[PDB]
Enzyme design. Structure first.
Site, PDB file in Angstrom:
ATOM      1  N   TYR B  59      52.896  28.235  49.029  1.00  0.00           N
ATOM      2  CA  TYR B  59      53.964  28.127  48.050  1.00  0.00           C
ATOM      3  C   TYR B  59      55.175  27.396  48.611  1.00  0.00           C
ATOM      4  CZ  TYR B  59      51.759  30.826  44.330  1.00  0.00           C
ATOM      5  OH  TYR B  59      50.947  31.209  43.277  1.00  0.00           O
ATOM      6  N   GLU B  93      36.709  41.140  42.143  1.00  0.00           N
ATOM      7  CA  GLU B  93      37.849  40.443  41.589  1.00  0.00           C
ATOM      8  C   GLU B  93      37.793  38.960  41.980  1.00  0.00           C
ATOM      9  OE1 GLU B  93      41.617  42.329  42.141  1.00  0.00           O
ATOM     10  OE2 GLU B  93      42.728  40.651  41.199  1.00  0.00           O
TER      11      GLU B  93
END
Ligand SMILES: Nc1nc2c(ncn2[C@H]2C[C@H](O)[C@@H](COP(=O)(O)OP(=O)(O)OP(=O)(O)O)O2)c(=O)[nH]1
Ligand SMILES: Nc1nc2c(ncn2[C@H]2C[C@H](O)[C@@H](COP(=O)(O)OP(=O)(O)OP(=O)(O)O)O2)c(=O)[nH]1
Lengths: 197, 198
Positions: B59, B93
């Protein structure tokens, strides 16, 4: 039970520094193409990854391209190691082991790979051992001194390689020694040392 | 034959946008777990790679960290897909397919992944398909609107996601739709679609 397990012949890995004569040496075996599986000259894939020269971009800006380039070197070695053949013998230029023990290690020290990048490559290496069979019976180490290697390199004259420092070739020399002579790395199968000056 | 082949039970993959509630949904299955293999919350492995927060670095500095991050995302997915189990059901997941068909696509488009890096990941996706068995029998898709997904991201307030704009989620949402609704990607076992706006 790993991918490629039980499918592979006796396998010899041709190792040595950049410009130690690895390709040249393997070329002698070419007339035996029908008897031996010969996987030579992986640089040619690295120079053309669907039109992209990863070798070129790695030399020009290592802090950006070190990691993607090493990722791809790992892929191509894995594809040669696990490549299928009916022949009694496979001989390969380079191996996943030199990428791991020499290049990746050196780029960690020289800072081209940051800690995070290095760890990624290292967990990948742990997963490959756990999941993919790398056949290894004999390493032939084309031993050379860094000055000789330097001279062979500039004569061959790859545009990508025109700024390779001798220092770098000394750093690499050491690591090939530590791995293949002074037995400093975890890995071990039979090693045959040849002088190539 | 591939690694992990023959060793995997019926397997369900939980998919949906960032913040869509995948982990929450999975916890409904928590009382069952001596009979179901539950592989949840892979973000945590990405936040701590022997100390290094790859999520944070990806990020902070995408053009440099997108590549190595995707590479570890792939690995961790492979470790889950091929994790051994004696239980008659696995529920995971995410999967390797959302990284390949949603995130990598987007990062390629926004310039975080240059052609060479993208080419490298794609070559790797092919070799995995040939070498590594990935069991997929059902995907459950937690469909949300990018705006609800955003609210949930904000409520959760992960420090890494502090600069994540609504536009990112709109982009990702349409990528999940192209794959799970319009079926513009390879297989997709069957897709059970769930409305995940409460
Ligand atoms: N094998 C290998 N080569 C790397 C790696 N990272 C960068 N390279 C570069 C260094 C060289 O510029 C280029 C080819 O080096 P090699 O010594 O593997 O092949 P080369 O044909 O130069 O060997 P030779 O001169 O025939 O002994 O690949 C790596 O991790 N593994
Ligand atoms: N799964 C996945 N996540 C990625 C990738 N690249 C970046 N990320 C980021 C997006 C998020 O900041 C973080 C985790 O997103 P996920 O939607 O997978 O997990 P999250 O816990 O946000 O979902 P949930 O709220 O439980 O539905 O990882 C990728 O290639 N795959």
């Amino acid at each position: 039970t790993k991918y490629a397990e039980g499918t592979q012949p006796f396998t010899v890995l041709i190792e040595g520094n950049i410009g130690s004569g690895k390709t040249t040496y393997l070329n002698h075996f070419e007339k035996y193409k029908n008897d031996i599986c010969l996987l030579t000259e992986p640089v040619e894939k690295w120079r053309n990854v669907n039109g992209v020269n990863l070798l070129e971009l790695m030399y020009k800006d290592p802090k950006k391209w070190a990691m993607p380039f090493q990722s791809y070197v790992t892929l191509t070695m894995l594809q040669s190691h696990t490549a299928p053949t009916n022949k009694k013998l496979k001989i390969m230029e380079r191996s996943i082991f030199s990428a791991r023990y020499c290049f990746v290690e050196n780029m960690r020290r020289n800072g081209s790979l940051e800690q995070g990048m290095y760890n990624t490559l290292e967990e990948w290496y742990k997963f490959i051992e756990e999941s993919i069979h790398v056949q290894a019976d004999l390493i032939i180490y084309l031993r050379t001194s860094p000055e000789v290697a330097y001279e062979r390199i500039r004569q061959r004259a790859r545009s990508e390689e025109s700024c390779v420092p001798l220092k770098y070739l000394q750093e690499l020399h050491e690591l090939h020694e530590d791995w293949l002579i002074h037995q400093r790395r975890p890995q071990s199968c039979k090693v045959l040392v040849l002088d190539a000056d």
